[PDB]
Amino acid sequence: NKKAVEQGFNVKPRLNYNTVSGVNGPLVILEKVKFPRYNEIVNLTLPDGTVRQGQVLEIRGDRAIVQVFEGTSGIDVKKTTVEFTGESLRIPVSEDMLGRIFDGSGRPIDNGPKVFAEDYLDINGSPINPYARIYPEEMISTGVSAIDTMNSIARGQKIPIFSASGLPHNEIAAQICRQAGLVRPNFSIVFAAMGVNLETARFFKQDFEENGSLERTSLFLNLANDPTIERIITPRLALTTAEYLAYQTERHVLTILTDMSSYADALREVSAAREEVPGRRGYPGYMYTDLSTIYERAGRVEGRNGSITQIPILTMPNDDITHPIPDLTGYITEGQIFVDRQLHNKGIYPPINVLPSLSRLMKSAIGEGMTRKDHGDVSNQLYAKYAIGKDAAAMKAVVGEEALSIEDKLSLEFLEKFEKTFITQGAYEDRTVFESLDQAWSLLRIYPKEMLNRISPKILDEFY
Amino acid sequence: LTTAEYLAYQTERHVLTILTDMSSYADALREVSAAREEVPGRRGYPGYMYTDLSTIYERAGRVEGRNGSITQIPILTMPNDDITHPIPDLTGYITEGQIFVDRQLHNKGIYPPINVLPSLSRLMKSAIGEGMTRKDHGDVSNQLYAKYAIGKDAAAMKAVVGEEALSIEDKLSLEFLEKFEKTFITQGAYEDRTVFESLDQAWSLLRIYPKEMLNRISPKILDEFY
Amino acid sequence: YGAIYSVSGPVVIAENMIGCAMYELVKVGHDNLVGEVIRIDGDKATIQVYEETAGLTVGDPVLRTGKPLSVELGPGLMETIYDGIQRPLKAIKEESQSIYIPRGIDTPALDRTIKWQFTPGKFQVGDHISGGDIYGSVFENSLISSHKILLPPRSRGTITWIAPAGEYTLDEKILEVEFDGKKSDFTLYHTWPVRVPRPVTEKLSADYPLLTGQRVLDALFPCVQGGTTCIPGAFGCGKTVISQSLSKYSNSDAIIYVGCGERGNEMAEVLMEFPELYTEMSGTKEPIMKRTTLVANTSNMPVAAREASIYTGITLAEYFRDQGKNVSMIADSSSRWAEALREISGRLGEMPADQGFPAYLGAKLASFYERAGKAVALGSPDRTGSVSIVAAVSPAGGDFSDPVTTATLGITQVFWGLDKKLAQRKHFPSINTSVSYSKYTNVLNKFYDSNYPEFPVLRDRMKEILSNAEELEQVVQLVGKSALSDSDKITLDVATLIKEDFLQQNGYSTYDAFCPIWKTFDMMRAFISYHDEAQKAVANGANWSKLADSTGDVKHAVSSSKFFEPSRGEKEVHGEFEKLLSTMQERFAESTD
Amino acid sequence: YGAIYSVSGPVVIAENMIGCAMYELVKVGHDNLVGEVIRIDGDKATIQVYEETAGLTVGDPVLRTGKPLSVELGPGLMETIYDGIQRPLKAIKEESQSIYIPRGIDTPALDRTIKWQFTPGKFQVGDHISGGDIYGSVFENSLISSHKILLPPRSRGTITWIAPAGEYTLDEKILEVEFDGKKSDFTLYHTWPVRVPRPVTEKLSADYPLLTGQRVLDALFPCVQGGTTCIPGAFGCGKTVISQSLSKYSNSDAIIYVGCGERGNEMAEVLMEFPELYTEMSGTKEPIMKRTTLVANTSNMPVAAREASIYTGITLAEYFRDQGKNVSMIADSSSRWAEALREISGRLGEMPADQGFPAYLGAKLASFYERAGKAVALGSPDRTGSVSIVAAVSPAGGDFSDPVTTATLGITQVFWGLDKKLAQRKHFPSINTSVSYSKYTNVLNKFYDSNYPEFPVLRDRMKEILSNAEELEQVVQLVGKSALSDSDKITLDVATLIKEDFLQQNGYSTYDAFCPIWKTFDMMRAFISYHDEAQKAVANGANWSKLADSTGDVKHAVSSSKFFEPSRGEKEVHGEFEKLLSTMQERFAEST
Amino acid sequence: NREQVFPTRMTLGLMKTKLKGANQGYSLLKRKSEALTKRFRDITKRIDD
Amino acid sequence: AFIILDEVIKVTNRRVNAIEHVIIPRTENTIAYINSELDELDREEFYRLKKVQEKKQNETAKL
């Protein structure tokens, strides 16, 4: 049957090089290497006995530029033995990961045994064949109305959460993680904490246990105190575990990659060590491809029932969309859930600002039997009236409420009862998509049918 | 600074080191930093200019065992009158005050052209006191600064709301600002004013306002003086 | 065969390689990864590899193929999806039995097994045949029927043996040319270097409009068949949707969609949606997918392959122009090509231009956009093809000041600049009418005079209305609407109506997926007539405040005219618009009476 | 031993150093100048010399040390001044007899001539001992008596000989360990790599508040032990008041004050003010210096020392946490440390990140702050220490847009936002209630609901009333003040009363200074009960002006409740408030 | 939200001076509105009388 | 006088609110954008000079 595993049932010796010809920053430059392999995980053995992993990055003939994940602090030329494993970094995956807590590099930290591998998969992964991809048309009844009815989430959606430093992205991402469920029929979850503080790590690791998800969530916790470069391989490890689960055991995985800005900062702090092309704002030029290698490991594939949803939480610095991390994340991903600092200050939970929020899989998974026929038109009409209300609120703050027209006053009323009665929601209150659409229609009934310039006449007649 | 260190610590005497054109010194640091292969820093000036200016500025201050003291007044040229320039920024970080010479005041012809609204000294409160200078100094300087700010605001306000519509306080403050910039800040190039004489002129200026209008002055100071 | 000597991402400096030419194609590594040479320093020739370089080892043999990056042209191009290099994704998947692109797959570019009904052209044995002459047409599908088999552009001589009509595979010889005593055998397919543009007899001024089917585009900023186009805009602005709604419903005969650095699910959406749509052209309801080929080099697929994907797409479009088809190549995310160039230059260590990009980015983009343009094909019979390039430049951070955007605006004749602010409000396609322009408006007068004579007049009138109301709204936002006159208030209301009911075109909707030229012209006439008649009524003495309540019915009928489904036919929708105009005139007459 | 090969400014390239690791301190030159190995290249090793590098002739011997930048942890580091590189400033002054720091001075970080009273712990010979296990205690002062003697965290084995109770000096073998052969021969002190966080068994949740003593900081924007805060640290904003309050009133049993790059005379002020600070401990008035160490570091000091100042301070605080003592590390102008980091990056040629700072600024800041937190100390016996960081942010150019300020505000959970305008208005402690925030309020429920249950609801009520007061002030600026309703007027008056007699605290008065948690809670109860009684009276239909005129006595009592001396004890203070609160309820009711 | 000014050191200085001028004008016009609204209240009282 | 003064007060308050909510936010955003663009240009120039320095050092080592 499974003859593939037997082919790897062999022994291969490894070369131990005590030939470190220098080291500078996080880069260890070897010499006299016997046929170096580009991107081969390498186990360094420090003089003190500490074993630091590292992967080759440049293999100029008979020389290897090994970058170490844990940092070069303590590496000696005449004492370190650098041992070449002869194969790229691989995580030992199995169906037994689900329910375990791993470190940044995949070494379990739950006082449990090493993963009884069913197979070893290269963490970099491979680009899924675009002919084998399936467009995700199965919408997820997320539970939060601001997402379910506007900026809708499909199954293979890769929709990040954009949030400022202090906004409750974790609370929202936990609510989506705990209430997500297919609208017209659970999610295995894979987590990857990159640079989160211990408070956030414990919040997630406790919310999963509280909701019972921890029986089917594998956590890759790379906290702030973990090595900075390990955050490069943490999301690749998480997505390789998720790819195994989904596309091989046919599970529906909801991958969460918290603090993707920390991963981007790790990319910048590694590129600046190699003096690479500085792109924009100091982030490397190839950071588009580096983030794409992460995000594109999502979506359903043909012939396999599995699917990987992604919700990479992102912390926008200074709450600026134009920053390279949110900008390239918006270009690569298929949506965004913009958590708004202004809304959070106003006190609304969830502080989702639907105007910058987007979902590119909402033109599908809407209408007919997937959801009520009014969804597609109602979401657009809500967007239009919300924007009109925002513009009229600015005009009011400038000139005064006396100059607001009848339409502007209606927009103000709609905006108020929208932010304070449609975006707002209990932390543990889940709203079905039909109930959210009914509330949206209740809001829309402020306007007469004439002012609703976006709803089709048939939809207006049937539902207004 | 080595001459100052000698004369002020090895010898027991005070020193007032005056350093001129720290902008020229920064240009010299730039020339040498780029005389090597070093890449230019934030604005051409080297990235270590903070340390290269701290090692010059900080070699001053009173010492426990010695009766001497080095006080530095680094004259500094602001290029394009931009405070956010690296030299003014780093000098503001390392030093303990800021004396501003104002282009507007100099054009008006006010010598010396110190504008006291932006200028300040952090360690003034350690100098002005009962044993050092007159005991009125702390309140007099605060009142003078407040009234000068009020006068500047009133001078701005006159051109938009008419001279006659200003309050009594602003109307007096306009005359105070005129008789201040024209008599107090204005000072001959060879006119030496002791701190007590400068405070006497300050009080002669502050007598414009009624005794109840000098809000910042302590009541005891108002009773003794005025 | 040389050997690898250094690998640093997608660059492989290969030693012992005396004899490799610039831009030659090499097979780097044991898996025979496809790579091209870009720099030569003695023996060591620096190779960029169009495949994942991870796992490469120093000493891995690299084979010099002896030919630059060549795309195979011929039958079977249509209705298929390709990777960056010319590899069929379907064939790769079926060969690998997996869902991943394996490293080094060498599937034939065009399906060899499928047999095509070759029918010889006018050329007979002994007649001199020059480059680009048509010596037969193969029945590709029901839509691209008569896929006329051109001779290679560089080939010349006299026919010695031409195959009779029948069924032939690609490997089967179809024609043998004798040239100076050296006979050369030609088949249904011929390779072509992607870097080298395909020759044409003479380019022509592009005087026919590429009807995008979207009201704002083909009514304010037209694109002609053969004109370079650019669509800058931040993420979510709608560049991809404009490109898809252009490739779904344009008047182009064949379409070469290029997803250079796009999303995988976008290409999957195209693959599942194009077979479900049918083009009314060719007299039948043939599917769209029978006329579109796709070059899918997604964002995470090898960085170097993005350039190969762009060049392969434009070469396919050039071939289908030489056939005589009005091609419309669409380069999705053309800025990803610039980023790939930047990454490769950073690997090489080359000195950067503005913002990290190499110094030759402008030259490469200019040479790429100059491939477009209507041109008479190379050989007999006379053929007039056209390639229209609609590339979506993706600015970094949403600012049009990006170097790729500037180097694209310097060459493209059309600029459909998208607005993120209008995109957020779902005001779609979010074309920024303030900055967008089309240099083909003057050229299209010769077509708008023949059909829809009042179209340019309406276009300038609506641009005037939009500009005047934009300036007025800018003033009002800081000075209040108190000082506006009745005419100014009418301009504000009319332009708001235009933006919210004419310029906005809700794609993925039954009624407004494709608003063709005739319905666009009629809606444009209705809007302009509403503005003009409202202004005439206010000049006659009627107060605008009362007129708004009196003519809300007419205003809502005008705003609801976009709901007239174009599928009802040109005669039906034109009749409905005539009735609406009559009702509008009657309503204003009654109100002003 | 190595040898100099090239000197070019601070960076020194030394030949014949096969076997040196990075970040290992090497004694450069004949004067034994200290420098860290930046990078290696074959036999060479680029060294960043800390002190001034003028006068290093090539061929000068360079001695390896074999350890990274290390801080010497042990008894005797209390009540003494250090620089960033852990050089005792008092000892340097005494030894050199010169007011300067002599170049390359190497006075040991801990006084080896002092004799300590060592009393061995429960561990005996033959008992297995692991890193972090306490095997003794040293009476170091009167405030920090029982200064434990930990085993070095990376050392493990079995005891072969333990010294008996007696008087010992450092560098004297106090305990010997045998582990897989060989011997350890430990002393009363051990050196720890500064950049490596000290290990702990488990990092607990910070569920206990760090009582600063100020009413506003201990009520509205609380700090938990093991929590990280931020302070604007503007010129004259009150950062001195906050630091002194923490140092002499906080629950922390040890204080670390790091001066990472502040001005020289500001450091002189700090070094002349802390010895004069006296903290009334359990016994009597005792100097705050016996519980506080100072990493005093003027901008004249070496840039490497400035960049390592916060690391040294946090490592000392970590060591004291491993002894079970709650620590409160105070960082002065962390933006100066960021500027030192930027200077070092500029020397190294590293490419700039946002606004010229190094690429790893956010990573270094996060990894530094993650050391702060209540953690159960490593080894036996079990003990739960904590390190809480109060880092002044000192924005560059007076703007909060600097990357260091942004990263610090994103990492720290508390931001006591001192305002220059509030400081100028003579409203100490100049805490701007409209910008300050503390994200530890949710966590502090587990303590409030156990000790003072109503306290979170009271705090939320005052935050709401202060926001409503800001809105009312905006309204009264827009239009006439009389246009406000009776309820709005009552809210505005109550909020002014709060801002004048609850938030505004005098740091010199005996009664006002160090308001305990119980007094703060009782005063909050009194204030909000007065506001609620006024609101109820207004709802009853009584005129606001008449009610205020009648209840002026209750208002005066509420305002003077600030003066209730906490020295009388919690029981007496609570009883006084009950009588004071009862009168307010009675007067505000019958007056209608 | 932002002007289309081409980013240059001269443009930055001009726009910073424009911000300073706008802030000064804001303070001046706020004080003018305060003075004129005090006078408006006085005029309203005289109107009632 | 009442009518004229009321009209002038409305105009002045409109201008004050406009400056506070449009001009100051717009100008502050423009300052931030221009400073970010200048920082990006300085970073690009730094990278170009760093590449030149690396080439010069490599050539010196090769000599």
Ligand SMILES: Nc1ncnc2c1ncn2[C@@H]1O[C@H](COP(=O)(O)OP(=O)(O)O)[C@@H](O)[C@H]1O
């Ligand atoms: N003309 C349009 N009609 C309807 N929806 C549109 C239109 N243009 C864009 N969209 C919406 O925008 C999203 C895709 O935007 P896209 O073109 O991918 O922008 P980008 O290429 O910048 O990611 C889809 O969710 C779709 O709903």
